[PDB]
Each structure stands twice: as structure tokens, then as C-alpha cells.
Design a protein around this motif. Structure first.
Motif, PDB file in Angstrom:
ATOM      1  N   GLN A 194      19.799  43.856  72.667  1.00 20.33           N
ATOM      2  CA  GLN A 194      18.703  42.955  72.973  1.00 20.33           C
ATOM      3  C   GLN A 194      17.500  43.355  72.114  1.00 20.33           C
ATOM      4  OE1 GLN A 194      18.478  42.025  77.425  1.00 20.33           O
ATOM      5  NE2 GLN A 194      19.970  43.698  77.462  1.00 20.33           N
ATOM      6  N   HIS A 205      13.956  37.843  74.470  1.00 18.31           N
ATOM      7  CA  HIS A 205      14.562  39.059  73.915  1.00 18.31           C
ATOM      8  C   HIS A 205      16.072  39.133  74.132  1.00 18.31           C
ATOM      9  CE1 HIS A 205      14.214  40.572  78.117  1.00 18.31           C
ATOM     10  NE2 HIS A 205      15.318  41.209  77.771  1.00 18.31           N
ATOM     11  N   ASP A 206      16.632  38.276  74.972  1.00 17.51           N
ATOM     12  CA  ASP A 206      18.029  38.400  75.361  1.00 17.51           C
ATOM     13  C   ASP A 206      18.797  37.194  74.841  1.00 17.51           C
ATOM     14  OD1 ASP A 206      20.417  39.205  76.559  1.00 17.51           O
ATOM     15  OD2 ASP A 206      19.691  38.947  78.609  1.00 17.51           O
ATOM     16  N   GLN A 214      17.741  48.475  76.344  1.00  9.91           N
ATOM     17  CA  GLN A 214      17.720  47.180  75.662  1.00  9.91           C
ATOM     18  C   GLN A 214      18.195  47.325  74.224  1.00  9.91           C
ATOM     19  OE1 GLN A 214      16.298  44.186  77.725  1.00  9.91           O
ATOM     20  NE2 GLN A 214      17.292  45.864  78.843  1.00  9.91           N
TER      21      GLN A 214
HETATM   22 MN   LIG Z   1      16.927  42.286  78.937  1.00 11.24          MN
END
Ligand SMILES: [Mn+2]
Length: 616
Positions: free
Chosen positions: A466, A374-375, A461
Motif C-alpha cells: 500500500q 493509499h490502498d 502498509q
Molecule cells: Mn491501508
């Protein structure tokens, strides 16, 4: 576990309160009283907002049941939103208080008036929102107290014994009000809750690391988001305190690291010692804790741990951040190891760097990673026809590009598939172990509001660009590129509730793909009925076409040579007549070509479908 609930309310408020105040002052709640059902873009245009960041804020308000969203995707107020007027904006001063100095006795009676307003429930008639506001007071102080372990027992020195008389008095009042201390034996004494809070203090380090972003969230939502998120003159990030963030990630990811034990043992107890991996590469190694904990499981508990001389093992740490590379080398100084610059998004370049350091057999690598897909750096999708096939699926994620604009969910999902496709081409027979964190739908977040972290976690996030997706969409994306979980090793969290926020999967390459059934597939699904059933027991093209349009995400297909070998259909109808339960019809229909039954592909499809349905 009924104490994590209190912590969870604090971390929710830490994020929710400045989002609420920013929207209030910009006019969001007044706008919705004047004109109602408004779409996202109608509000963006009226408010001059950054559409991606504003959608993150809308999701959060829906998850508090302050907004409802109709079938045209238009928002309106609920009655719970009315409390938004009672919140005082000066609470925002708590983000910058000099707490360390105050604990040193150098700031006088700094917290007295804040503690008094907390004793009044912030003059709200709402205990839940009073807890939310308490988080802005509690979290900076909890982290400061943990610095010097001040929030600990009468370890020959009683509770607040080392502090000045002023701060003993102010903290004594707060602690008794929070239930962190009581008056046993005529002295101030910690309670169970107070010991728990001190021990778990670092669970709040991650929301606290986002304080610079949160204190500027007006500009994220409605201004030039680029003056946030732009980096230092020394190249460091400004939206976040990265060193506190990493200390927080590390503390919180530990309880999931231990659950990797069964998968790691299954690999290194595997019979012929010669067929075991020669390397373990952790992409995003951070401080190196996961690699160290893995190495010790192998050394002291596995068969391979008794054969390290015939069969050397080497740990490889890849990370993009120079500080993580330096930290990992220290953690792994005693072990055989290699540390490399590299990126979650570019597994081919990682392979090319491994060669430069003498590793020419990357087919002997076991790959692992935790909380990193996710990053990644968003790479726009390049398979244009594949993007269009999936444009009608109702994905429920929210992702923001670096211009503050909303990335359409199907574009994000097609980009994740292409990212996992790059990984599948360097994965070998030893597979790929992934821990990952996922988002939830607002209706589900509200039903379990203080049982999970999603209200604040999914928000920060989203704001920090992200890319979270649902547990089952991540699972489906791996399967569309040929990667499949070893079902007996998989874990989902939280185990005891009907939603999934975190997944642990040991993925395996297999010579097929599993995908959703689309309308273009309808001929081949009709033929599959002729080849699988006698003429009396076949579904009609009307019926099948229904299933594809009622439940586009309830029908799975197994593909081999661009040929559909099998399909599985799940459907559930609830009666419309009038937590408890009413009349229902449930249907699960598996078709597998006689051709392929003996190999067990029917079994593999059915088993995948049941786990997919559990993640959902
Ligand atoms: Mn993260």
C-alpha cells in the motif's frame, strides 16, 4: 493521552521485533559493522534482499535511531542498535500461542514463564525495548480478553472471577505488573489503565491482523515474497486475517467519522434545498457505518432532514469486496440505499454501473471516502513528460511493487496525480470529501516515537504493498489536477503536534491548478517580476534560480491557460554560528499579476500556501 503512549509502545513492538530479528539472523547488523556507509542497493546485492521490502525495514530502523543515513543516502549503525543482540528469538513463539483455549482453562500454566521474563524486563537494561517485547505478550491476550469482556469492573462479579485458578493466578501477576489492577480493599481490582486498555483493545486489531505476514517477514525481506501475499484456494488473502483487520479499521476510523459533521452540515443546510445533492456515494463503504452516521446527521440535524419527501436522498455504497457489500446492506437495511461492486481506481466504471441501476444524473452526487486512496491498484504513470518534471523533488515515501522491488517515489507521486485526475473528471459542483492517512520522515518519527502510530503503521502498509505519501504531497497532488480544500472545513491530526499523520479535506473543483515552480518556468517567473514590481524592488534571476534549487518544494505557482498567474516563495535561513531557537531570517514573497488581483487569486494562493506549510 499518556496512556495511549503505552498502547503505542506495544503496537510498535508487535511489528518492530520480528523485523529486527529477521535482519539480525540474515546478517544485516554484522554487514554494517564490517563495511560502512552502505547504500540500499549495496546491501540488497550483498544480502540477496527484496529491495522494496528491505527499504521499508531500513526506514523503520532509521525511525528507531538504530541507523543513520548520510547525504549520499548511505546507512551506518548508531550505538542504539547494539541492544539488538540482547533480544531472544524465542519470543517469536508468542505469535501462535492458543490464547482462547488458555482462557478457557484448557492449556494449563501456558503464560507463566513469559510473564516472568516480562517481570525481568526481558533481561534488557532498556525499559523502552522491554515495552516493545511486552506487546507480543499483551496484544493477543488483550484481544482474547475483549472477546468476553473479561477485563472489566467488579460488575457484581469481581475482576478475574470467572476463570480457572491457574489462569487467575498467572493473569493476576501480569496485571499487577502492568498496572492494570491493584489490591484495593484486599481484592484484585481494575485500575484506570486497565479499564482504558480493555476499552481500547481494538486499536491493536490491525497490527494483530498482520500476524501471518509478520511471522514470515524473513521471506518478505530476503526470500520469495510471493509465497506470502499469494491468495487462498478460495481466493482469500494469506498475508492478513482480513476479518479481524476490518473489525479493527472500523473501530479506529470512528473518531474521525464524527469530525465529518461540520462538512456534511455545511452541504445539507445549504440554502436552496433544490440545489443539494440527491446522492451520497461512499467509495469503499466497508460495513456501511460511515454512510449510516452521515445519514443520521442529515436526518436529525440538517434542514434537508425535514424535507426528505420533497427531496429524496439515497445512499450508495461502493466496495470491491463481496463481504463488505453484504455487510453494508445489513447496516443500511432501514435506509434508502444502493450497493455496487466497484474499485477506488476506476471511477469511470463506477459511473457506468450507476447507470445500469437507473442513476443517470451523476452530476447530483456528493462523493466521500475514508482511508482508501493509499490502498489502490498501482497503475504505472502514463504522462511521461510530467513524470520527468518532478524527478528531482526529494519525496520521502516508500512503496513496494508486487515483485518486491522499490517503486521510485516520484513514480508513485505521478501515479497518485493521475489517479486523482481520473477522480476530478467525475467530481461535480458538490465536491469530494476525503479522510486519508500519511507517512512521515524517519527523523520526525523518532522525535515523536511514542506519540504517533507511524513506526508500526507505515511499516505494515509498506510491506503489504500500500502507498502512503506525506500529508502535503497528497494536498499538492489534488491541486495539480484542480482540486482544492475548503480551508475553513479542513482538519489535521494530531492537532497538538508539529507533524500531520491524518488529513480531512473537503475538496472543491476550481478553474486553475497550483504546482511547484520548476527550472523550465524560470523565464515566466522573471517576467512575473517585471509585471509585479518596479525595477528597484525586483528579485534577480540569480536569486530566483537559488530559490528553485535550495527549496524546490517551497515555491508554488498558480497556472491558468498554461500561464503562470502568480507565484509564492517561502524561504528560511538559520544562522550557523555558535527545541530552543537561534537567529533566523524568514521570507515570504507573493507575486500576483495586477490582472487577477480583483478576483482574489492572490488570496487563494496565499491561503493555500499557508495550509500547505502547516501540513509540512
Ligand atoms: Mn491501508
Amino acid at each position: 493521552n499518556a496512556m495511549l503512549q503505552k498502547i503505542n509502545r506495544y503496537t510498535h513492538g508487535f511489528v518492530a521485533v520480528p523485523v529486527i530479528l529477521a535482519c539480525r539472523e540474515k546478517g544485516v547488523f554484522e554487514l554494517l559493522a564490517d563495511e560502512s556507509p552502505l547504500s540500499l542497493n549495496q546491501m540488497v546485492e550483498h544480502l540477496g534482499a527484496n529491495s522494496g521490502h528491505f527499504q521499508v525495514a531500513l526506514r523503520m530502523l532509521e525511525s528507531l535511531h538504530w541507523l543513520s543515513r548520510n547525504k549520499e543516502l548511505k546507512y551506518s549503525l548508531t550505538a542504539e542498535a547494539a541492544i539488538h543482540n540482547k533480544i531472544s528469538e524465542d519470543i517469536l513463539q508468542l505469535y501462535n500461542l492458543p490464547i482462547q483455549s488458555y482462557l478457557e482453562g484448557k492449556q494449563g500454566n501456558l503464560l507463566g514463564r513469559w510473564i516472568e521474563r516480562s517481570c525481568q524486563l526481558w533481561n534488557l537494561d532498556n525499559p523502552l525495548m522491554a515495552d516493545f517485547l511486552d506487546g507480543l505478550l499483551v496484544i493477543p491476550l488483550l484481544l482474547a480478553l475483549h472477546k468476553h469482556n473479561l477485563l472489566a469492573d467488579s460488575e457484581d462479579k469481581p475482576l478475574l472471577s470467572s476463570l480457572s485458578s491457574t489462569v487467575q493466578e498467572e493473569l493476576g501477576k501480569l496485571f499487577l505488573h502492568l498496572g492494570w489492577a491493584d489490591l484495593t480493599a484486599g481484592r484484585l481490582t481494575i485500575t484506570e489503565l486497565g479499564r482504558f486498555m480493555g476499552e481500547r483493545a481494538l486499536n491493536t486489531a490491525i497490527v494483530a491482523s498482520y500476524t501471518p505476514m509478520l511471522s514470515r517477514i524473513h521471506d518478505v525481506l530476503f526470500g520469495n515474497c510471493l509465497s506470502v501475499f499469494q491468495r487462498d484456494a478460495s481466493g482469500h488473502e494469506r498475508h492478513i486475517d482480513r476479518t479481524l483487520n476490518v473489525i479493527g479499521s472500523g473501530f479506529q476510523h470512528q473518531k474521525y467519522f464524527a469530525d465529518l459533521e461540520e462538512s456534511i452540515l455545511s452541504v445539507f443546510n445549504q440554502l436552496p434545498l433544490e440545489e443539494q445533492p440527491k446522492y451520497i456515494t461512499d467509495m469503499g463503504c466497508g460495513d456501511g457505518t460511515l454512510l449510516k452516521r452521515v445519514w443520521e446527521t442529515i436526518q436529525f440535524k440538517s434542514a434537508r432532514g425535514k424535507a426528505l419527501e420533497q427531496y429524496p436522498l439515497r445512499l450508495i455504497g461502493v466496495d470491491y469486496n463481496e463481504a463488505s457489500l453484504k455487510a453494508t446492506t445489513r447496516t443500511l437495511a432501514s435506509l434508502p440505499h444502493l450497493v455496487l461492486q466497484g474499485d477506488i481506481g476506476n471511477p469511470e466504471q463506477m459511473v457506468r454501473s450507476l447507470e445500469a441501476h437507473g442513476i443517470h444524473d451523476p452530476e447530483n452526487i456528493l462523493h466521500i471516502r475514508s482511508f482508501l486512496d493509499h490502498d489502490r491498484l498501482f497503475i504505472p504513470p502514463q504522462k511521461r513528460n510530467e513524470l520527468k518534471e518532478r524527478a528531482h523533488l526529494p519525496y520521502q515515501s516508500v512503496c513496494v511493487d508486487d515483485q518486491g522491488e522499490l517503486i521510485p517515489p516520484h513514480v508513485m507521486v505521478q501515479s497518485l496525480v493521475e489517479h486523482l485526475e481520473r477522480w476530478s473528471q467525475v467530481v461535480n459542483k458538490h465536491g469530494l470529501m476525503i479522510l486519508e492517512v500519511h507517512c512521515l520522515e524517519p527523523r520526525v518519527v523518532y522525535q515523536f516515537l511514542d506519540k504517533s502510530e507511524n513506526l508500526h503503521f507505515d511499516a505494515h502498509q509498506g510491506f503489504s504493498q500500500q502507498y502512503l505519501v506525506e500529508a502535503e504531497v497528497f494536498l499538492m497532488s489534488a491541486a495539480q489536477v484542480g482540486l482544492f480544500p475548503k480551508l475553513e472545513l479542513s482538519k489535521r491530526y494530531p492537532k497538538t503536534f508539529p507533524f500531520t499523520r491524518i488529513t480531512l479535506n473537503y475538496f472543491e473543483k476550481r478553474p486553475y491548478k497550483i504546482s511547484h515552480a520548476y527550472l523550465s518556468d524560470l523565464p515566466a517567473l522573471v517576467d512575473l517580476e517585471v509585471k509585479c514590481w518596479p525595477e528597484n524592488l525586483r528579485a534577480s534571476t540569480h536569486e530566483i534560480r537559488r530559490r528553485l534549487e535550495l527549496n524546490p518544494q517551497g515555491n508554488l505557482v498558480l497556472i491558468i491557460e498554461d500561464q503562470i498567474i502568480g507565484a509564492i516563495y517561502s524561504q528560511t535561513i538559520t544562522s550557523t554560528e555558535a527545541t530552543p531557537q537561534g537567529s533566523v531570517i524568514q521570507l515570504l514573497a507573493l507575486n500576483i499579476l495586477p490582472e487577477f488581483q480583483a478576483r482574489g487569486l492572490g488570496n487563494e494562493l496565499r491561503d493555500f500556501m499557508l495550509y500547505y506549510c502547516t501540513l509540512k
